[PDB]
Amino acid sequence: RRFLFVVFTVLVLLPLPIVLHTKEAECAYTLFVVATFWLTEALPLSVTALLPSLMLPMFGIMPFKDFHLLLIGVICLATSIEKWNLHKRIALKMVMMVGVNPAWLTLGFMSSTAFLSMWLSNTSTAAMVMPIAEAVVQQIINAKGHVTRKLTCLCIAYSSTIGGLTTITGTSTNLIFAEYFNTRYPDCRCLNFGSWFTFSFPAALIILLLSWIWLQWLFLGAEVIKQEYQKLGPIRYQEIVTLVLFIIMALLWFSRFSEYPGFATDSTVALLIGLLFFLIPAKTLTKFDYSPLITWKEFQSFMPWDIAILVGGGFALADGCEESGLSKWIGNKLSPLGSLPAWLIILISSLMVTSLTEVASNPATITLFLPILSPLAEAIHVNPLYILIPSTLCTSFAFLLPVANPPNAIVFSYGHLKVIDMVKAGLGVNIVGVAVVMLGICTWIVPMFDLYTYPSWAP
Amino acid sequence: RRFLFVVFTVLVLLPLPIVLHTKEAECAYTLFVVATFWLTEALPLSVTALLPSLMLPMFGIMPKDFHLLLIGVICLATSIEKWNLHKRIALKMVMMVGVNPAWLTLGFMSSTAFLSMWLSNTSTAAMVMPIAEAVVQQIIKGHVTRKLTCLCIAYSSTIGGLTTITGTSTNLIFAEYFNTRYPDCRCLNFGSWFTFSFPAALIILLLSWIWLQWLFLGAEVIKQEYQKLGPIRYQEIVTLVLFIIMALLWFSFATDSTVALLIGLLFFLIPAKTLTFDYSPLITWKEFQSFMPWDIAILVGGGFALADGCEESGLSKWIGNKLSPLGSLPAWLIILISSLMVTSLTEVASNPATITLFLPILSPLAEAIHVNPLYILIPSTLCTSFAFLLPVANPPNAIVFSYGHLKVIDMVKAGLGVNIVGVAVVMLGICTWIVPMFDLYTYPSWAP
Ligand SMILES: CC(C)CCC[C@@H](C)[C@H]1CC[C@H]2[C@@H]3CC=C4C[C@@H](O)CC[C@]4(C)[C@H]3CC[C@]12C
Ligand SMILES: CC(C)CCC[C@@H](C)[C@H]1CC[C@H]2[C@@H]3CC=C4C[C@@H](O)CC[C@]4(C)[C@H]3CC[C@]12C
């Protein structure tokens, strides 16, 4: 029907009243309705986040930091990159340098959006490169033509998903993990921009280079590209300063200094370079007056404000389940769960989140699964990073059917790509992604964070 | 000049280095920069708020019911503005009191005074002004009616911007400053603000109507503007009945945030009659995200960071032992000389900037001289809104200035009397009816 999720919303609040007895059932009812509206997306993912703060007081259950500074500093750069169309110039420049094209054009279209989705969002990059890739494939073919379109679509979407890793500020499921982690463990200083990039870039490079070979074997065995570049025009003043500030912020992030009062952090670099976008004149004379590179309404458009509401709603639901009396019941109900090998819990939880993320949303899976796996990690006396590092990477591995993330729903709205093509292509990419994450969590991420010893910022 | 406030930004960070000595004159440098950029508006009022988060660590100086009520009122106001119910309310309040020259100024005043309790002053002043221009043009001594109508719209949108904590940003800043710093106070909410602020604003509105009517000037032309926006549709009858339900539930787990979230979250759920194979709600999330004030929290966080930074850097001790005879004054004289200062500075500055600068000045002074904090902080937040002179203070009277009429001396002569009667009514109120409502003559228990 049409009015589906008004009657699905109002017709699950009616049978679910197990509420007509003790308090832990009243908290189970809140947990059920919030999880059901998060999984099915009947409400827009932050109206649901405000529902525990409405429903827990009526039953009787009662209750800025550096990551926000870094998020402000990266959104300031991303708004200027997307606004002045620098992101189209540095996508058509990676193509035409790699594009020898027996099969290197697929690698160029993968590497462009993989680099671009480290900074922008996956949805915006997948919506930007797909017209360019469609025009390039059309004007190369008009000079086997059906498999190139679906290969190009899948190589855009999957590599925009893969490039969405390697940065904490690259996807929303990374922002949610970082905001959960620095709130639950505020005595921990080992997770920042560079330490995330250092362990996540060797994984994503291997996943990209293996997915290229997999898709190129699965589907298949000059002036046409140097004409969409000249339709961009010449280079403007507003995107040379954005490029210079990009290069300066990038090589100031990864290069950490010597002095030590309090300001050698990443949020200092983020604010100190990203607040120059409001100040530097664009040479866009308002007419007596000038205009900057970035105004405040555009920043407010680009800034994710609902992520903090989502983290606060998840934390409120977790404390409601703690102080209501429910977590004791399911904690004494699941006592043989802590007699497992610690790597088997990694395996079953990673397969669980990467199976659930194919039909659910990427923030909705990780917001439900982080307060399940954190006290389990503290209880069985393993490192709480050892459990939570592979689960946030396996939640991003949404490569099957186009209901999981909007990156492969954008490339699906075009005429090509049957659903069985997406399923058969994304199954091998999911397999190699889980295999590379399992290799990494036992080979190179172990000495980087000392995962085999219980930490000191944990209870 | 054109690039004047880039070289005002970069050439005040250069002479201000008194920083080349002790720690106390390093927090008296980030104070001057932030205060100057707030008073001048060289940076957009929240880029400046993030500056103590950048400048205080580099010197060596290291450190929710109102949010839910704000979410509820913002998602009500989004649906009121989106489906054009405010035009129906404004054109219905006029034409009841609408056949005389005066009683038509009062209708245009009462419409935007009622409408700016819920919407913003800028949005109501930019909506009633074309309607009022069309009515004054098609009804028509012809030149003085235009400037009288412009000034009555711009003043009554400001006067109506009181009576609600969620009615103007300088009220939101005070409420967010006061639910912090005194978290054991449970006497300040929506209805207790309305109960003390409505009798003041009604008297100010009526006396301003009489003042402007004496100062300036001693049927089928309004109805065709009401029949121009058609009959009433489903999406605004639903918004009207939810407005009436929320309004008569506010004035009677039973909190104001419960009323704001139980009725306010129904706007995202209720099906509007715009079928997308699908349907669309009354409001979506992008519209709410555009309407929601996100920079007010950044502003109050930057104010709290700058206020706490003056504590460990021993500057507050210096300017506290420097101003020791300040605490030998009568307590009402502090009200008088602070309310006159906040109503004089706000004519040339911004309304959030003045109150963000002056709340951490007046709130420790109240605890120092052993009076009630609300006694000092209520007339200062009421008098900061009294921006009725020249059109650089608030955008409500800069909207009505962009039209052809209304030179500056008219605004000055008209706003001087409105400022005088506003200060007089607030001084009468804080000594007559706000005293037993909050027990202002005794030192509280939420105060140290
Ligand atoms: C979804 C959130 C908000 C609420 C529910 C949290 C549940 C799933 C969590 C919170 C407390 C957890 C328990 C905490 C401690 C132990 C003891 C350990 O030897 C085995 C696992 C076990 C038994 C955990 C199982 C999972 C658990 C019950
Ligand atoms: C963020 C900036 C603006 C904060 C500035 C705070 C200043 C204005 C405050 C903080 C400490 C205050 C002092 C604290 C105590 C006393 C003693 C009293 O007998 C007279 C007032 C006096 C002397 C106050 C004057 C105002 C004061 C100096």
Ligand code: NA
């Ligand atoms: Na991205």
Ligand code: NA
């Ligand atoms: Na998904």
Ligand code: NA
């Ligand atoms: Na208002």
Ligand code: NA
């Ligand atoms: Na002002």
